[PDB]
Symmetry: D3
């Protein structure tokens, strides 16, 4: 047991899927996992462990922001022997060619946070995902007929930033998606010798705004979870 996870070694699988909103953990468990059992309820962060095609897998939300996901990823890594962490969620896009519902795989993650500088002697730490995990995700997406975009994400500390101009800079340097965790999770993974990957679906633009329906989000979201889950299987093979 740990400060934020009321469970014992063995309760979580070596691979954990982590959605932003906690509510999605229960949904992932009953929609994609078989024989799911509850393994955590502290602070309302429901955790579940089950199997996907015989493969043991766990799922539990990580809350919003670098400080929150840094806590859970760390405890999962050092207290429950977790080897791989896959964050699944959404992001905003700044590039005109990146459309709503596109799938983005964060090979790297920029940030305006100071956590990595605190870890790296105030130098530039390239917060990156595990390469094999990125390629597994891309191939799994391909197998499902999905066109996945791979590149840099930007993990913001402030959803409501004072410097609106930074989005122009992000666009100029090819940032594919804007979210709030990747750089933090990649930092933790690097600090404790584990693997991580962030997968996001474009939720909106930071220019204008396309209009759709939850019907065009349901299975697009399901597509993302499918990608994450199938990518783990390719990783094992």
């Amino acid at each position: 047991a740990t400060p934020h996870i009321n469970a014992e070694m063995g309760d979580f699988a070596d691979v954990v899927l982590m959605p932003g909103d906690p509510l999605r953990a229960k949904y992932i468990a009953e929609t994609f996992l078989e024989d799911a059992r509850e393994v955590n309820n502290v602070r309302g962060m429901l955790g579940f462990t089950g199997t996907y095609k015989g493969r043991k897998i766990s799922v539990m939300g990580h809350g919003v922001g670098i400080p929150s996901c840094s806590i859970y990823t760390k405890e999962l890594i050092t207290d429950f022997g977790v080897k791989k962490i896959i964050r699944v969620g959404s992001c905003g896009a700044v590039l005109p060619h990146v459309k709503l519902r596109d799938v983005v795989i964060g090979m790297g993650a920029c940030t305006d946070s100071k956590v990595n500088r605190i870890r790296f002697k105030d130098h530039d730490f390239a917060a990156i995902a595990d390469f094999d995990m990125v390629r597994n995700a891309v191939d799994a997406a391909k197998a499902l007929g999905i066109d996945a975009r791979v590149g840099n994400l930007f993990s913001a500390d402030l959803f409501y930033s004072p410097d609106g101009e930074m989005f122009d800079v992000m666009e100029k340097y090819g940032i594919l998606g804007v979210e709030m965790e990747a750089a933090g999770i990649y930092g933790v993974a690097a600090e404790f010798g584990a693997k991580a990957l962030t997968i996001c679906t474009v939720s909106d633009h930071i220019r204008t705004h396309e209009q759709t329906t939850a019907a065009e989000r349901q299975t697009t979201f399901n597509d993302m979870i499918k990608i994450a889950l199938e990518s783990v299987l390719l990783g094992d093979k």
Copy 2:
């Protein structure tokens, strides 16, 4: 309605109590508020509005970390006309004379986060609470026979920091409590012209560790909520 709060102007009172763990919102509403009604459920962040001695008051969790509470405090301030925000929770202490269960009022908040430097041209912004709110809290504590400690809090981005030595520095400069939101909330309050205060009860030491029981936490926690609630009334008078 906003991205994270599914409610309309008027749903929240001008004063909002915000506990770390969401679960505590429901508890505060049924234990201290009368005629409470549910006003938000997005992402599981239950919000409630009711009255305390005829005084309209709302309560809703703010999640863990500066990035999370920065989102909610901002939306409450700019979209729901909230005037005062009081964070209630716990903290770790580094000073030998600060004991478990002591009540700490954050007049100021240090941090290792970069959000305030991003707002203040990379200069030092003194993240402070509203003075009247601090004095109301102190007096209310006094009226309940509580001995309140007032000073600096430290809002950490990383609960599991690599630099263990920083705690020695915190002790040397008199930091009363270590938590993860104050500096963020004070920053937002300053950015959008509102008032904020953080009140914490010492949850543990960062040296050794005292041992008690949940029985000595129940009403100590209730004491804190009482302080927060009575402080609002003194503020109105």
Copy 3:
């Protein structure tokens, strides 16, 4: 005796009022103190000790700037047993509602300096005043029929700054006054375990632009001094 103070333990009271201008120290000693004796003249930084309504009090200039006042307050605290320091000066206003002759009390002080970062491992140290001294001042002002404003001051290293943009930032984040020592004095107080407070009268506006020089301006300066002196009396009771 210390490098910049040619006196001996006992020559100063445990409470020291400190204006920026040494000539202002003599003015204060001649106007409010009974039987005031000069206790220091090194570098012309006049220091005086006398009694206010029976209480032993000292007053001494601290020069212009954080580097200057940091030396004097530090020597007063570590070598003359001074336990409280109250800076009494003038500041420039940035907020339109802050008028001339308004009394400002800095419970917090933002800064341009790098001194607190050197002290706080390059993180954000919230330079705050001692809570009881702030409250004593508010009450003394109230007793005198004066509405004091409590909030953030901005301590600048450059009276003639090359970036006029900061003033808008200061205004946006609610800085009540701009001066040049508070953040330095509060840093020292925390480093050596003492208590400090900065009280200022607005002598110049930068929002509407305006100076001051009249009987009314000098009446407000004297009120500020009475607030400082009366606040020490309340601190004792």
Copy 4:
């Protein structure tokens, strides 16, 4: 022609391999390219163009350091229509498991330099390689029976650094190799919309300490070059 390159559009292929040492460029052109013509000699920074298995390819030294390679890659991209740059060099190891003759592929590059901060408004820019080029290299290596390691490289400004402590930090966070250009080249590629990749062979260890100079060392260097060349072929198909 540009300031440092005396050639004309067309003299270079759209793909350029770049070793640090110009003499190494001539070596590469003489060893793997057919009908290689010298296309630049300004400052002795030898550039060559020829064909590898029918494909037009160029190779040219980039000098030592981010400042140096930043100039050449930038001119190649904005004035010679170069669309891909593959740095082929050597790096020092920090991790005990990273042995001599191991082929390292930098999907990411940490740095000491301030160049990306100047570009990214002082925030953390994750300098990453183009995903397809990384995958092409992994597959080409596989086809050659070589196990390549993919991860972070560290680009240093000081080959002789005054702080030997960084090496432990680099090891702790899993840096695979230490060199001096990757972060610079990846910054340029993102700024001007091109694609880049850095491939290195470990020529020195800092964990166990050791150099190299043998037939086996030179065999591994040539393997790295074949990996680079074969990877461009796969990129076309």
Copy 5:
């Protein structure tokens, strides 16, 4: 007249000697200047203008610290036509081979202050003295048989620095003397278009701990002043 100088264009000469101590200016005007006339008394920062060997010369203290001397040097330059500023003060030595009473000419000035970074977009501005003034001072010294070292000074913001290790770094890089103004005077001179030079007398050793010694003060101080005054005449010629 300016905010800190009650004088009129013409009251000051085009060259001004500035010691930290206001009382030293008075001593200089009475000892080396003829027909000396006091031109400023604001804040007790005594200012004098007289003649030396027929040359019109002024002398005025600048107070302690970068923020103080910056104000005065700025006002002299923009409102009184001052072209040359020569600081004549005391400094602490960190090098073993540098002894007390030694005269150091600061051709450069290091600092832990943020004033120059604020002026120079957060980059490294090399705060240097005017070459001819340095050359003049070295020559005037030879003609007086006085020894003088030319190199870097370090202008600290904290006389009571909590960072003792920094003195070792200063020693390693050859800092000849530690004072508190040079970097500021040079920053101001470059910003407002004037020329400046700092000449210091080693008053003590930061290592051996021992301020000014015996009556050797006045004598060595007089050497510095003589060197400063003579160097002004070489300049005119």
Copy 6:
């Protein structure tokens, strides 16, 4: 022999002229040195040692950028007994009154590089040249009838800087020339205990856009070399 210099103690003179361009070193050795002998060819960084007016002198390129020249200057100083390093290069002007072919002596060197901050605990290290070498160069120039400005240079890390505004700041502060090595050479000289000086020829104007002009290159370049060589003789005397 060192990692980048295949020579032996004794092959280099105690003073070394270093241009950026390796081919320029060759030109200098053939044009100004007698009995010139090549002592290094590693990476094509040609090095020569001959005699000038009987004085043993060496000349070797240092490559482009701070990271490159730092390596070479360091190796020369610690393994070949080099006491004096004189960089002879080209620079870009930002001041209108500074024209092409002008000779500038860098007594100081600003920079946007982080190398000196890494050496100087993140503070401001004023990168300066050895006073006597500067004085020698100014004198040798007068004796040659050549004009020469003495002041600050700016050593940039990015020749293709995305920050155009910075040139205005450089102009405001009197930067005489923009190059890419000075701050590094001076940092190294101070770290490894040697003396250095940078003499530059204004090759173009960053504003007017126009590199070296006509055959005026060789002539002005020869003036710089002559000045450098003669200054070495003044030094010996």
